[model samples]
Target chain A: NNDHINLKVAGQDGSVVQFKIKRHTPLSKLMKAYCERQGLSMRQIRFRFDGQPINETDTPAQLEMEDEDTIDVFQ
Target chain B: LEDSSTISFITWNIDGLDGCNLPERARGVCSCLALYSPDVVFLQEVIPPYCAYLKKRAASYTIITGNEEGYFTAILLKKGRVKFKSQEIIPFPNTKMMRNLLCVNVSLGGNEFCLMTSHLESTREHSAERIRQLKTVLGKMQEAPDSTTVIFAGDTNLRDQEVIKCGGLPDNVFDAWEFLGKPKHCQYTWDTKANNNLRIPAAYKHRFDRIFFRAEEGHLIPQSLDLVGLEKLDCGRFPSDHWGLLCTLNVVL
Candidate 1:
């Protein structure tokens, strides 16, 4: 069975977007998708989970991201 | 009779367009510019689509971009307020980053002044290179005609003592913040409180942006100086990671 997790991306403006991804997917992919939707680039924004900057190489399983976990986006 | 001319100047590192909600940040920047209407604006870290976005919004101004690659500095001069005479972009030598000094000669109401903006090598590790770059630009600025006024503005990325320890500014050039009696409050142009999202340590804070000017014959009087860009948008967004340094000066002609 494929492992997957649901997460919530919270923007600086208090808005939130939900995403569900496979445990093996890189965080950069999610960041890229967010940037594309927001008209920004990966370098222009930062992602944080539990107050630590999210590494682009990290995955849901590596970071232990769980269902409904929040990822804060800073621009 | 001497005629007094008023000029508003702003210098900001716009943080580029790669960050989240850039369209919103762009709108915030446009709103700030429309509110202040500075005569000259020096911007750093402008890249790609954001450059086009700002150029379109500032259509009434003459825009000049640095000759370097990737993210570069830019200058905007309000139309009809100044006549452009010449410009030069001096890239720093032996530097790891693509840093450049942009110089422009212009006349405001018949009074000519050379305006220059630069972004030096950043971070504490590159402090030595920053000083070297500063010395090079200051030496070149000395070549301008003594009779004409000279104004240099941008993110120096160095502290006040660092600047003084590095042979100081060119002779006769005065820091606008100090010239106006350095207000106790609002002196900091970079504060973690305003940009809590910054990945760097929250303890890092400084006044990294400034406007320095020199006059040969007449006086370059600073009317007022302040740190702007603190106004949060309705969505609770600060315009950029760095606050802008805005100053109004009266040049006697």
Candidate 2:
């Protein structure tokens, strides 16, 4: 099933630095696309699903894909 | 019966349990707990910034907090009896105001239990909505294993009437006050400024405060219940206009 997900980026400050990334692709592909578009080091960027505190050890492959899953990116 | 140490636990919103001086009101609750030195204390409706203030003010004890949109819920603990396991901010689905449930993990007397503090949706006209919110919280606890003892405390907003109408307490969850039978007075906690007493019938005087226990092996025994009002505070002032309810409990061996 194709799901449109909004990718929001937040920094140390509580403001939403970025928002609304439509994705029908898997999380791994999404991360790769984000890295390619933002010119960020994969080592420096971390993704959090929903609003939960992200685990440093999480890999894209381990994430359970969900429809319309909002991902938050934090550096 | 195992000779487990008796740990005093107090749940109150404080609102300066004392009424004369704000400082004295603050100490009102402190002085009461000082006499018994409760092992765990859960506070709700505390101001946001004040959540951190309590930690600094009561530096002697460890504190965990849930800073909600309007009111905050805090848990103060004695140093060794309870170690900070984790604090999670749980969001209630479909509510006009932001409501959160704070879960604090601590080990008391070598027994582990999750101490939850929450302030549910009040003021909203629909009671069914609040019941759904409560059910969401209960669902979370139900997910936990049977070995995990869950103690849920806070301003539930639903009084005896509402609970009875809404299926009379969820399965596996028991009200601490109901477990002890309805107390003579302590039935109402909110004050609307007119009657100002739990004894008086008022639109908002329904019993809003509660303590729920999901005992694993043992049961929670309520020692005493206090429905603090203006008279109890002994000053003309009412803290937060909501009388605080405090219940002392002992784990039955």
Candidate 3:
């Protein structure tokens, strides 16, 4: 209820990865981790929550993200 | 294949520029939406205050706005009915009116749907950019996953000739109103004869707002088309300058 959030990032290939991140921490960390594991580049993919692009500096709290919220990626 | 279920939706341009009695008008909009409770909502000309009011008033619907700085399109999804998957805002690079396609991919009734909405370039003089914007929308329609049924609706602001100029909506896409027999009553969304919210003269009546649907054979079927926001508010004005659309479609089993 306070700081950290459990977020889900779903890929176009129908795969989902979960991340436990701080509310104020940037989503780029999670994005980079997801891309590295998937062997993709940030420029080659797009991370979105509610259809709005997630940026390097955007934290979960800034995006009004809730626990268990999902951010889907598109090419 | 997806399951068979009837889905209802509304595509409306709630004219946010008119500053007077906006909250009341917004409430009126909420009233109609509460009554019908459509699965998805595609709204154009929405302002920050209007969107905020909607957030507090319509708590059951999840609101996603397109542009935060200025007046732009927004989508409202029933929190319980539609399963959210993904969303993307396709830009109109040359748009002077700040219009873009706001699309959301969701699963409803066990069917995947790509819902797109936008306020295409306004006025008759901006036909060139409007045509370009429409081409972008049509292009996006072709790029969607084959398993998803795409429905695009909003204030296209296109005159009848503009559709022809945009290459005739492709061979597969069907205009919802035209597919529904072009009922005489459901014509002319931006009508000065009926809605007097705006003080514009010249007695213009054009179907600026319309819905277009593209689906595989028997995947999604058009069921009904009707107008919303017909009642006048206490301030003696309709909800918005343009009448909203209340449409329903059937997803075949």
Name the top lDDT candidate. 3
State every prediction's TM-score relative to the real structure: 0.73, 0.64, 0.76
Q: What is the interface RMSD of each candidate, in Å?
A: 27.6, 24.7, 16.2
Q: List the residue pairs that clash in candidate 3.
A: none
**lDDT agreement with native, every candidate:** 0.77, 0.61, 0.83
Candidate 2 residue-wise lDDT, B69-126, digit = tens: 4557788888765656677778776766566788876666444578887777876486
What is the Cα-based lDDT of residue B24 in candidate 2? 44
**Model 1: which docking level applies?**
incorrect
Q: Write the per-residue lDDT of candidate 1 for residues B134-215, one digit (tens) a residue.
A: 8877776788897578888888888657787788876677788887798866588888865753546557788888787877
Task: Mark the regions of model 3 whose C-alpha exceeds 4 Å error after superposition.
Answer: A1-75, B1-4
In terms of docking quality, model 3 is incorrect
lDDT pick, better of 2 and 3: 3
**lDDT (Cα, tens digit) per residue for candidate 2, span A26-52:** 445445534543456779877777555
